[PDB]
Design a protein around this ligand. Structure first.
Ligand SMILES: *O[C]1[C]([O])[C]([C]OP([O])(=O)O=P([O])([O])O[C][C]2O[C]([N+]3=[C]C(C([N])=O)=[C][C]=[C]3)[C]([O])[C]2[O])O[C]1N1[C]=NC2=C1N=[C]N=C2[N]
Length: 342
């Protein structure tokens, strides 16, 4: 098909964990769009019901719901991984609890449980892990000299995630960062120690903006929080998010696809970082898309993100898939909130 020399044959089955999630649903969408069959897991079939209906209508018989109530359970993937040529492990703890135990441990456990299943399944040749830019750093507004590459690790989050008092408003963020960081480190360590017969790549998105396919049963994650602002809600949690990088949900789906099928992408940490933004650029975009609508006034200046990311593999993947360059923030936000038109 489109993808020449794809490592996974046309129509191959890909297992996507936590398929009812926001980012995962976009990864599924892109896989289906490219002719691959997908078996997506969710803690309940009901959680995927609306998305199943969407995909059955758009991609008849290409998506299959698979129930995995406990992603940490021994043998959890024995049945659903059968025949899969690729695996995309996307599910992770996003409760933003300040409890290191309820976030970090399960994050690592879920990651290794999926990796072990893949290692035990000869048919699996490619594995893509959804990490995050927080596995490299927590944004530091107005700070110069920050360049993140594939060797950048958020080592400071591991210590802060358990040294910071619960009163620090960034506590849960550091715990989440430690969970992502330790989970990804564990994945690469597993690869180097066990040397399984599949290739691993990780996608590290920053703030993912895009269409929430199932508003009914999808909270939306990052995009859901942005939608709440669109609807006029200004939550303090929103203030716990500093200026950083955005990335289109469409592009994140494409990066996962590239990691699963492009031959030139192996053992890479692919940054999903299109450009910088802050809540005021978001509000500005809202006002541009809906000139007649009332929106909250600008937030106080929160500085700007002066960091830079090594996006070489990301750009290589996008170009190889025929969608070169990053989708703009205006188009990304429009994918989420639409525009004033008729
Ligand atoms: O169930 C659940 C779901 O499926 C998931 C989640 O989803 P949400 O919430 O939507 O979120 P998200 O975001 O999509 O997530 C996914 C992934 O990705 C990542 N990231 C993201 C981003 C943005 N968005 O922007 C960036 C970066 C990165 C994260 O981290 C993750 O990994 O999941 C699931 N879960 C939860 N919890 C749990 C689960 N499963 C199972 N178990 C448990 N515990």
């Amino acid at each position: 098909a489109k993808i020449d020399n794809a490592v996974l044959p046309e129509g191959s089955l890909v297992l996507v964990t936590g398929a009812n999630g926001f980012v995962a649903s976009h990864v599924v969408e892109q896989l289906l769009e490219h002719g691959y069959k997908v078996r997506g897991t969710a803690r309940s079939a009901s959680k995927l019901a609306n998305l199943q209906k969407r995909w059955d209508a758009k991609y008849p018989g290409r998506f299959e719901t698979a129930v995995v109530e406990d992603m940490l359970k021994q043998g959890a993937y024995d049945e659903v991984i059968k025949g899969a040529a690729g695996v995309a492990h996307i599910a992770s703890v996003v409760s933003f609890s300040n409890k290191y135990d309820e976030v970090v441990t399960p994050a690592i456990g879920g990651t290794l449980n999926a990796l072990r299943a893949a290692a035990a399944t000869p048919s699996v040749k490619r594995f893509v892990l959804t990490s995050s830019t927080v596995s490299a750093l927590i944004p530091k507004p107005n700070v110069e000299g920050i360049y993140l590459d594939e060797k950048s690790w958020n080592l400071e989050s591991i210590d802060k995630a358990k040294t910071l008092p619960e009163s620090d408003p960034q506590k849960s963020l550091w715990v989440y960062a430690a969970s992502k960081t330790e989970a990804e480190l564990a994945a690469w360590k597993f690869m180097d120690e066990n040397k399984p017969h599949f290739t691993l790549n990780a996608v590290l998105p920053n703030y993912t903006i895009g269409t929430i396919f199932d508003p009914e049963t999808q909270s939306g994650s990052t995009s859901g929080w942005m939608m709440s602002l669109f609807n006029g809600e200004v939550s303090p949690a929103l203030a716990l998010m500093p200026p950083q990088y955005y990335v289109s949900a469409v592009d994140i789906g494409l990066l996962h696809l590239g990691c699963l099928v492009l031959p030139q992408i192996e053992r890479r940490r692919v940054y999903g970082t299109a450009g910088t933004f802050d809540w005021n650029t978001v509000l500005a975009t809202f006002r541009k898309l809906y000139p007649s609508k009332t929106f909250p006034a600008d937030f106080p200046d929160q500085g700007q993100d002066l960091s830079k990311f090594d996006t070489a593999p990301s750009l290589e993947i996008l170009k190889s898939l025929g969608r070169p360059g990053w989708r703009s923030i205006e188009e990304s936000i429009k994918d989420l909130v639409g525009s004033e038109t008729a």
